[PDB]
Design a protein around this motif. Structure first.
Motif, short mmCIF file in Angstrom:
data_model
loop_
_atom_site.label_atom_id
_atom_site.label_comp_id
_atom_site.label_asym_id
_atom_site.label_seq_id
_atom_site.Cartn_x
_atom_site.Cartn_y
_atom_site.Cartn_z
N UNK A 1 0.83 -1.21 0.00
CA UNK A 1 0.00 0.00 0.00
C UNK A 1 0.86 1.25 0.00
N UNK A 2 0.49 2.20 -0.86
CA UNK A 2 1.09 3.52 -0.83
C UNK A 2 0.00 4.55 -0.60
N UNK A 3 0.32 5.55 0.24
CA UNK A 3 -0.60 6.62 0.52
C UNK A 3 0.13 7.94 0.37
N UNK A 4 -0.44 8.81 -0.45
CA UNK A 4 0.03 10.16 -0.59
C UNK A 4 -1.13 11.11 -0.25
N UNK A 5 -0.80 12.11 0.57
CA UNK A 5 -1.75 13.10 1.00
C UNK A 5 -1.15 14.46 0.91
N UNK A 6 -1.95 15.34 0.31
CA UNK A 6 -1.60 16.74 0.20
C UNK A 6 -2.68 17.52 0.89
N UNK A 7 -2.25 18.32 1.87
CA UNK A 7 -3.18 18.99 2.78
C UNK A 7 -2.88 20.44 3.07
N UNK A 8 -3.97 21.15 3.36
CA UNK A 8 -4.00 22.60 3.54
C UNK A 8 -5.10 22.85 4.55
N UNK A 9 -4.72 23.13 5.79
CA UNK A 9 -5.68 23.43 6.87
C UNK A 9 -5.41 24.84 7.37
N UNK B 1 6.13 14.62 5.52
CA UNK B 1 7.30 14.91 4.70
C UNK B 1 7.72 16.39 4.76
N UNK B 2 6.74 17.27 4.99
CA UNK B 2 6.95 18.72 5.13
C UNK B 2 7.44 19.23 6.53
N UNK C 1 -4.68 27.59 5.82
CA UNK C 1 -3.43 28.07 5.25
C UNK C 1 -2.16 27.32 5.63
N UNK C 2 -2.22 26.40 6.60
CA UNK C 2 -1.06 25.53 6.88
C UNK C 2 -1.08 24.39 5.89
N UNK C 3 -0.02 24.32 5.12
CA UNK C 3 0.12 23.32 4.10
C UNK C 3 1.09 22.23 4.58
N UNK C 4 0.80 21.00 4.18
CA UNK C 4 1.58 19.88 4.66
C UNK C 4 1.30 18.70 3.73
N UNK C 5 2.25 17.75 3.74
CA UNK C 5 2.20 16.52 2.96
C UNK C 5 2.49 15.31 3.81
N UNK D 1 3.52 18.07 11.86
CA UNK D 1 2.15 18.03 11.38
C UNK D 1 1.35 19.14 12.05
N UNK D 2 0.72 20.05 11.23
CA UNK D 2 -0.14 21.14 11.76
C UNK D 2 -1.46 20.75 12.40
N UNK D 3 -1.91 19.51 12.21
CA UNK D 3 -3.05 18.98 12.95
C UNK D 3 -2.67 17.70 13.71
#
Length: 229
Positions: free
Chosen positions: A15-23, A50-51, A25-29, A54-56
């Motif tokens: 399994x591979x999981x990629x997530x691109x997120x923006x909460x 990876x960024x 204005x905080x951006x994170x991967x 984690x902002x959340x």
């Protein structure tokens, strides 16, 4: 007679999981790797931000970060939409309402890239309170467990699901997270529209003591249920 997509889950599948997120204005991967054994409804994954930090809080992401790995009891196999949509895949869209706080809107594509099962996710978060439970990092690094109630969306040739997560807060209180979910298939090929049932799900959170990046180790069991035979 065995179904098209079912064949593909008879063993251990990576399994591979990629997530691109923006909460707010905080951006994170987030990237994740692991394996899943539909036979036992068992998933083991490790997730890394990876960024940086984690902002959340990690637990808020668990539901978003592969219900095709659910164990369906034999007598229920004609009701497993998730695997009937492989290997072409499905779109999983959710809105997640944190009570007295913001919402997550998510869109994922779940499909095979060769042998590997892939979950690619865009996540958008808005209207969170800066000193709330979420952006204030006041949730417990705690397991979460509950039942996902599934029904058919005959008009969209897919399914709908609704469920609630009780996140524990450090003070003993609870942060409710209302999940709403629509899954539609990417292929043109037929799929299995189910009768109402649910997926009993338990996720256990832990850490890799040797790991310095902000990360989450996840062990997870998922079993379909709620039809009689």
């Amino acid at each position: 007679m065995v179904s098209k997509g079912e064949e593909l889950f008879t063993g251990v599948v990576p399994i591979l999981v990629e997530l691109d997120g923006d909460v707010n204005g905080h951006k994170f991967s987030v990237s994740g790797e692991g394996e899943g054994d539909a036979t036992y409804g068992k998933l083991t994954l490790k997730f890394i931000c990876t960024t940086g930090k984690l902002p959340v809080p990690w637990p808020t992401l668990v539901t978003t970060l592969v219900q095709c790995f659910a164990r369906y009891p034999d007598h229920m196999k004609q009701h497993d939409f998730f695997k009937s949509a492989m290997p072409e895949g499905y779109v999983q869209e959710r809105t997640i309402f944190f009570k007295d706080d913001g919402n997550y809107k998510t869109r994922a594509e779940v499909k095979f890239e060769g042998d590997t099962l892939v979950n690619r996710i865009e996540l958008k978060g808005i209207d969170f309170k800066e000193d709330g439970n979420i952006l204030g990092h006041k949730l417990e690094y705690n397991a979460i467990s509950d039942n996902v109630y599934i029904t058919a969306d005959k008009q969209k040739n897919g399914i709908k699901a609704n469920f609630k997560i009780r996140h524990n807060i450090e003070d003993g209180s609870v942060q409710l997270a209302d999940h709403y979910q629509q899954n539609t298939p990417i292929g043109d090929g037929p799929v299995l529209l189910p009768d109402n049932h649910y997926l009993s799900t338990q996720s256990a959170l832990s850490k890799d003591p040797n790991e310095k990046r902000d990360h989450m180790v996840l062990l997870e069991f998922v079993t379909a249920a709620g039809i009689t035979l």
